[PDB]
């Protein structure tokens, strides 16, 4: 549960994401894959990628690093009302990926390191506060469809 002012922050953010989605979501996934290696063997599509300066040349991790920012982007945009949007990845992500919620607080973990890489001394500790909670939320709405489903 977020504040309207919380919520701005958030949508703030945001905009440095929207600026360069290719270039944060290809860093998003690089930092995910190179911190644990273990969520690099669920894609298929990426398993065969042994360094990070592969990792850094393919475009189809770009790709899919934009996707990913995507979808999450339409979420972060409904401030919470985000049922509908939730659902199918929730959905996907714990029965046809398999995907444990340990990897999307690993994930999440990442997007706050990326920001502050990326945008170094221009995202202040409210800002990591109200993103924080939003990835929060984000991972506990899932985690509760995880739950419905059984799945661990
Ligand atoms: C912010 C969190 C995430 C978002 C918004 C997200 C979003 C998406 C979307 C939109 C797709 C394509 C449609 C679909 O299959 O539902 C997808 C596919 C996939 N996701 Fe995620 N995802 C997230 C986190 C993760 C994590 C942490 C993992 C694994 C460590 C993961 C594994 C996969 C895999 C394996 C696919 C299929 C890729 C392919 O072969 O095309 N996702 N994700």
Known sequence: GLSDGEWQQVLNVWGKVEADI????????????????????????FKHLKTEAEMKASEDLKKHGTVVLTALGGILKKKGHHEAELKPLAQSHATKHKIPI??????????????????????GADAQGA????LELFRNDIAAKYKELGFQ
């Open 22 to 45: 290719a270039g944060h979501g290809q860093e998003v996934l690089i930092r995910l894959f190179t911190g644990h290696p273990e969520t690099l063997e669920k894609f298929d599509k």
């Open 102 to 123: 340990k990897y999307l607080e690993f994930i999440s973990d990442a997007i706050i390191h990326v920001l502050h890489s990326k945008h170094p001394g221009d995202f």
């Open 131 to 134: 993103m924080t909670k939003a």
